[model samples]
Target: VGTLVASVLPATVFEDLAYAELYSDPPGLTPLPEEAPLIARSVAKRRNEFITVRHCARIALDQLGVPPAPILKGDKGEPCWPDGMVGSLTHCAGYRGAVVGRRDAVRSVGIDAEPHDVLPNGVLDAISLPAERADMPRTMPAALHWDRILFCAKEATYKAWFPLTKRWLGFEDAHITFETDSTGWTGRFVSRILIDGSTLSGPPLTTLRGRWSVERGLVLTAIVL
Candidate 1:
């Protein structure tokens, strides 16, 4: 998890970024008391995910010089972090990761990881906007499922979006375009957010820049603001 993500991020995107990665679901993982309740009623699969992801978050917090603590969620379902800090977490089968940065240097951050496979039948339409459907990544390489990358990118944009505005950004709110590196594996994405936050603070916002990569059966995208 860390190997790909660490390099996929831009060379100097965060001067003070701290991140943690776990590639295996090792035994004996446990959450702090405050975090355990969230998984109490959850099934085995869920408990494992929560335990593994929270561990990644704790390590990230420690790396940032903050005492490890229960990473809770806000009313809007986003991660709640220490004062002056911003963070994001994500997990896919066999993987979990976290990234942290000072709020002063980074106003917001969002990330997501998904299996590198096509979305289930008809699911793409559900998550896609009309513009997105009209301009699919038809010209991209065949080995990668562009649709899955599209799906992953939207979540990343939201992860980066919510904290900045405390607003709900629907999947239809943005049109994303990807440009790959020479290897045709890692790349950058630009999301042209279509909705105007007319009643919101940063309404009329234009675009957000993010990085993306496809590696080892996973597609990763991150937005840093």
Candidate 2:
């Protein structure tokens, strides 16, 4: 699990982190007081994901000199961190991870994971901009699917975006470019915000930096600020 995160995450973003690979339902991992209402109506599967990811977040907070609190959901479904802290968590089939840092050191962070599979038909069209599709390599090995990476890039971008702007970002609002390393397993990307008049913290953001990796049959992406 450490290897998967290290592939895409830079060491400078956080002082400590926690991650878990959920092979089975976590036992006795209950939600904290503030989180109960958010999951009260959720089904068993969703509740499990919620509780387990918070379990990971709690571990991260423990290392950051913050008490373990129920990581509640914001209006836009983003994590609500304790004051003076920033963090991000992601969970997919068989994976759950969290990274936390002091707000004074890092303003925000975002992470996302997805199965390394070719995106379903038409997904690429919906999520990618025209110029983004134009820049995609025409031919590549079957093992690499650029489309899926683009999807993960957008997810990571939005995760980092909301905490700063507190606004919605459409899939087409960000244009991404990917570059691979010598091993082909790791890469970095730049997401350019294409909105006509969107200003973040009073200034329009031209681009955001991020990283990506394909490891253990999963495509993971991250952004930190």
Candidate 3:
């Protein structure tokens, strides 16, 4: 499998970073010994996803001049990167990706991918706010699954959000809206953090912005901060 997914990713954000993707299994795929416990009892499908995604992590770290290292999970189920590194991982049908950036250049990052398919019944309502809903009138591609994109956007947002805040950002806690040009293939999103009015210590990032794309039967979203 080719790196089709990575090519469609936000090159502006991930281009200069240590990033990689896997459409097929990695050359030698198996969980690092230290990571086996995390998926020891997982089903085959779950096991495969876990293994493939972490392999991407290993390659990404290598690209950053880091020796092969096992990526373990934190208490919140987020991947724990090697010290001085920040990254994100996403896995969907036929796609697994990892992007790593040195913490000095990027404070954090969040990335997500989803099949270009509609969300099942009731999922949208549960995960969306009123203004963030997608059934409203809009002038976008007929093939664009805006609802699924919204979910992917939020997933990416949460991934970037947690590392900075060290807390959960509920689907309802952040409001998501989109901005796009005529390209029809790529766009940007702004996540309005509604819970707290306080500012981050360094950059005061109360507002989070991210890039998105629709391609190869998938909706990809990312944030680099």
Q: lDDT for each of the candidates? A: 0.80, 0.78, 0.80
Off by over 4 Å in 2: 1-3, 13-24, 138-141, 196-203
Task: Give the backbone clash total of model 3.
Answer: 0
- Tens digit per residue, CA lDDT, model 3, 66-89: 888888888898889889898899
Q: Write the residue-wise lDDT of candidate 1 on 94-180 in tens digits.
A: 678788888777767788889899889989997887667666665358898888988999998888888777778888888888788
lDDT of 2 by residue, 67-172 (tens): 8887888777899998988778888786777767777676578888888888999798999988888776642344788888889889999988778888788998
- TM-score per model over all chains: 0.92, 0.90, 0.90
> 1 in model 2: Cα distance from truth in Å?
6.0
Off by over 4 Å in 3: 1-16, 26-28, 134-139, 197-204
Name the candidate, 1 or 2, with the larger lDDT value. Answer: 1
Instruction: Highest TM-score: give the candidate number.
Output: 1
State the number of backbone clashes in model 2: 0
Task: Tell how far residue 67 is off in model 3, in angstroms.
Answer: 0.7
RMSD of each: 2.0, 2.3, 2.3
